[PDB]
Amino acid sequence: KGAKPERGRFLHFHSVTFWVGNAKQAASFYCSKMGFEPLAYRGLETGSREVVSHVIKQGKIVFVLSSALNPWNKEMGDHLVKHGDGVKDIAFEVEDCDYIVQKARERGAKIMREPWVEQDKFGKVKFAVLQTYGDTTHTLVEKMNYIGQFLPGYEAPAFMDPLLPKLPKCSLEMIDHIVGNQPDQEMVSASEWYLKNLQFHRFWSVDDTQVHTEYSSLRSIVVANYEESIKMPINEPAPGKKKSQIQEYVDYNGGAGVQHIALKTEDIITAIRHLRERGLEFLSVPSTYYKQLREKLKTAKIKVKENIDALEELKILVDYDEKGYLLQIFTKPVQDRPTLFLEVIQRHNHQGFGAGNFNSLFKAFEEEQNLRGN
Amino acid sequence: KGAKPERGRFLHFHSVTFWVGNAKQAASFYCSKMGFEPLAYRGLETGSREVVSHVIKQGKIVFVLSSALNPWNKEMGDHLVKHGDGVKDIAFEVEDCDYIVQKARERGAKIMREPWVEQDKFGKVKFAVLQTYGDTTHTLVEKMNYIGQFLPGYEAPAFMDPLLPKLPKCSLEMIDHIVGNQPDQEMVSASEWYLKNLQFHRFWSVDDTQVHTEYSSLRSIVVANYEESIKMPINEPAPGKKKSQIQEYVDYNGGAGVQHIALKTEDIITAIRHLRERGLEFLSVPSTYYKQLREKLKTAKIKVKENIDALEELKILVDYDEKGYLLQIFTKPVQDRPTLFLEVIQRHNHQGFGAGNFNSLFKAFEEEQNLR
Numbered sequence: 001k002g003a004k005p006e007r008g009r010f011l012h013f014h015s016v017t018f019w020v021g022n023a024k025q026a027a028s029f030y031c032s033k034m035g036f037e038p039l040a041y042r043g044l045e046t047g048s049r050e051v052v053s054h055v056i057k058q059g060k061i062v063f064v065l066s067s068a069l070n071p072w073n074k075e076m077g078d079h080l081v082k083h084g085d086g087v088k089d090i091a092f093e094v095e096d097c098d099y100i101v102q103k104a105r106e107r108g109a110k111i112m113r114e115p116w117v118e119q120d121k122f123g124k125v126k127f128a129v130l131q132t133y134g135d136t137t138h139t140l141v142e143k144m145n146y147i148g149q150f151l152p153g154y155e156a157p158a159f160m161d162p163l164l165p166k167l168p169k170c171s172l173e174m175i176d177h178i179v180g181n182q183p184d185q186e187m188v189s190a191s192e193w194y195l196k197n198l199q200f201h202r203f204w205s206v207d208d209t210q211v212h213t214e215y216s217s218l219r220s221i222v223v224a225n226y227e228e229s230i231k232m233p234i235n236e237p238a239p240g241k242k243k244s245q246i247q248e249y250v251d252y253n254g255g256a257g258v259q260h261i262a263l264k265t266e267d268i269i270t271a272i273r274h275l276r277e278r279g280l281e282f283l284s285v286p287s288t289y290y291k292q293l294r295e296k297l298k299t300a301k302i303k304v305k306e307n308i309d310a311l312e313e314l315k316i317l318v319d320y321d322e323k324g325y326l327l328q329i330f331t332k333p334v335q336d337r338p339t340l341f342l343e344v345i346q347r348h349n350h351q352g353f354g355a356g357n358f359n360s361l362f363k364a365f366e367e368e369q370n371l372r373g374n
Numbered sequence: 375k376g377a378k379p380e381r382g383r384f385l386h387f388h389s390v391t392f393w394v395g396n397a398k399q400a401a402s403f404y405c406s407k408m409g410f411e412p413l414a415y416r417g418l419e420t421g422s423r424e425v426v427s428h429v430i431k432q433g434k435i436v437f438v439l440s441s442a443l444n445p446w447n448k449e450m451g452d453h454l455v456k457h458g459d460g461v462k463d464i465a466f467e468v469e470d471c472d473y474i475v476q477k478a479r480e481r482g483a484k485i486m487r488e489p490w491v492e493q494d495k496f497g498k499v500k501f502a503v504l505q506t507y508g509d510t511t512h513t514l515v516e517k518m519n520y521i522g523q524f525l526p527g528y529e530a531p532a533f534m535d536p537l538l539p540k541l542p543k544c545s546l547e548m549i550d551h552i553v554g555n556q557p558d559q560e561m562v563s564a565s566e567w568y569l570k571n572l573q574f575h576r577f578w579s580v581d582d583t584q585v586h587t588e589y590s591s592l593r594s595i596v597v598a599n600y601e602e603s604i605k606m607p608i609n610e611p612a613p614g615k616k617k618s619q620i621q622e623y624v625d626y627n628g629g630a631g632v633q634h635i636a637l638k639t640e641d642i643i644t645a646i647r648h649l650r651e652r653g654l655e656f657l658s659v660p661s662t663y664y665k666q667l668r669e670k671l672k673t674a675k676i677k678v679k680e681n682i683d684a685l686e687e688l689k690i691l692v693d694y695d696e697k698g699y700l701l702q703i704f705t706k707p708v709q710d711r712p713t714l715f716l717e718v719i720q721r722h723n724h725q726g727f728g729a730g731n732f733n734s735l736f737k738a739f740e741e742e743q744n745l746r
């Protein structure tokens with residue numbers, strides 16, 4: 001949706017690396033309650049004596065849970081005391097890594113790790129780490145004739161949970177978008193980091209055409225690579241009807257970081273029905289939200305293929321324009337700090353993110369409080 | 375048995391408080407994989423703005439998973455960088471909290487928190503915190519006409535996991551014992567801390583009537599309150615045929631701490647089948663252990679009521695003497711660091727702790743090696 005970069009390409013999201021206090025229990029949690037399955041493992045049993053990593057997978061989504069094996073680890077320890085459990089690195093699978101790293105250096109980005117190559121019998125892979133907002137980093141993955149299962153240096157998982165095969169499939173397929181919350185007046189600079197250093201462009205959608213700040217208490221700029229396969233909204237607090245939840249994140253995260261990861265699915269009724277069966281908790285939606293959605297769809301230009309009675313019981317939200325609609329629902333925070341959560345989304349010819357639900361939910365709670373009093 | 379202390383009494387284990395990086399997911403793990411159920415909760419929704427605690431319960435066992443809510447917490451943060459996830463506090467429900475604290479301070483104990491009282495709609499409870507080995511502490515709880523579900527300041531859990539009722543129950547009843555590993559030459563001071571300051575006594579068992587050091591690589595002093603409802607073995611590394619795992623625990627924990635918690639069941643066959651169905655992992659036991667077990671039982675004075683074929687499939691261990699036997703099995707470490715693990719035990723007139731299995735497993739692993 002802009003100009004074309006001469007060299008390099010960002011294929012898609014490769015993986016999301018979490019830095020958690022207990023990688024064993026973290027990988028167990030995401031497998032039990034979000035439909036992930038063990039893929040690879042790195043730890044003491046494999047020769048990695050300082051850092052353990054549990055690799056889990058569902059569809060094309062790859063999560064990495066990592067913890068420190070020895071005491072007095074400063075880098076991982078400070079990150080855990082500062083943020084708690086949260087996202088550390090967002091990986092991009094790229095083509096022509098050497099130009100992307102050097103052109104990013106020419107534009108003034110901090111190269112945290114110079115390009116290096118790891119190898120096993122299955123091929124070679126090139127990596128490189130750049131620093132973005134807060135302590136969040138971006139690792140670049142370039143497969144150079146690599147054929148293995150995941151990456152070199154990871155063996156078969158340490159343990160295969162026999163409970164996972166008996167649990168219903170959640171049908172989560174790929175990562176749609178990853179939102180990074182920024183502190184005050186840092187949305188523009190953080191969004192410029194990708195346009196400047198990685199030659200991204202601002203992704204425009206129907207959300208950019210409404211003033212939702214009075215109901216959202218946030219400002220948002222969506223940034224995307226050239227092919228628009230990687231989309232990452234960048235948020236910052238804004239004044240609004242209520243105190244900004246972007247500020248609540250920054251206060252509890254200790255700075256900038258990933259607010260939520262969005263996972264795209266093609267069957268959100270099956271996905272949410274099975275995720276709730278596995279025990280995952282989602283946001284509360286009042287009954288008046290679906291009382292109002294039925295009246296809206298009588299005058300809307302589109303028809304929803306999904307059953308409205310099913311959406312009401314599963315507490316799934318809907319946002320539409322004149323040409324399509326999307327279905328979305330958000331989990332409760334996956335930790336105790338009101339920081340990181342996750343989102344399940346299904347798209348029906350709609351490139352938005354649900355900004356219309358800030359006004360929709362405000363009207364839904366408005367009738368509910370109007371009922372309890374008037 | 376002994377001479378009853380003048381005043382005061384230690385009723386039983388109250389609870390075990392963990393200091394973990396994610397109290398939400400930690401409480402989910404013990405509920406999903408060990409048969410616990412949400413009991414009470416403390417957090418931002420309840421007014422507790424600095425420490426979040428998910429309280430879970432199974433039988434009489436009560437675990438408390440706690441984390442820090444605000445960034446840059448020094449004490450909980452340093453404990454997390456040093457130990458990782460592990461036990462922080464072992465609580466005792468006591469009678470006459472004020473004298474137990476007064477006698478402990480008089481005998482030289484470090485009182486971390488003086489006796490204080492909290493009160494809600496269900497009654498009053500008195501607390502006191504003592505420091506024991508390493509960074510582990512001991513909270514004394516005294517119920518003074520409290521009738522509520524747990525303790526004041528805790529309300530109904532934030533979320534009732536809808537998957538838990540669909541999972542089979544694990545039939546774990548109570549905490550049998552809690553073991554604390556000490557470095558070399560600190561077993562005596564740590565174990566004597568309880569006899570001196572709390573008027574505990576040394577608990578002796580059939581394990582103590584033999585020397586198992588060449589196969590266990592550890593020394594142990596088991597401490598118990600007067601009523602012997604609270605048992606806490608205190609370990610230290612000792613030279614032996616293999617690398618001391620009591621030493622490897624201290625190396626990865628940064629000092630003394632709780633090595634494992636033991637949970638008692640009255641049906642270990644059902645417990646282990648359901649724990650394995652829920653996804654809990656246990657230690658590997660070679661098949662030659664059960665070939666040798668059936669040969670030992672042809673001569674033993676006792677008869678094991680449980681199916682030997684079931685013990686072999688579930689990888690449960692057996693230790694017996696001339697008057698009874700116990701069944702036990704150990705989980706893999708509940709973290710990636712080889713520090714804390716857990717044990718499930720069923721007792722059939724046997725007051726030991728399984729010291730004979732070090733020798734039994736060593737001979738079993740040796741026969742597997744020569745037959746490969």
Ligand SMILES: O=C1CCCC(=O)C1=C(O)c1ccc(C(F)(F)F)cc1[N+](=O)[O-]
Pocket residue numbers: 177179216220233234235260317330343353354355356357358359361
């Ligand atoms: O996808 C992001 C893009 C930036 C703004 C942010 O609000 C979007 C979230 O997905 C989103 C969308 C809607 C809602 C609502 F209104 F339904 F609550 C909430 C969020 N959210 O969790 O930030």
Ligand SMILES: O=C1CCCC(=O)C1=C(O)c1ccc(C(F)(F)F)cc1[N+](=O)[O-]
Pocket residue numbers: 551553590594607609634636691704717727728729730731732733735
């Ligand atoms: O319960 C403790 C008491 C102190 C000594 C210790 O060995 C006891 C453990 O339960 C125990 C018993 C047996 C084994 C064996 F030999 F099977 F590995 C291991 C442990 N243990 O993990 O401490």
Ligand SMILES: [Co+2]
Pocket residue numbers: 177179262343353
């Ligand atoms: Co989103």
Ligand SMILES: [Co+2]
Pocket residue numbers: 551553636717727
């Ligand atoms: Co034991």
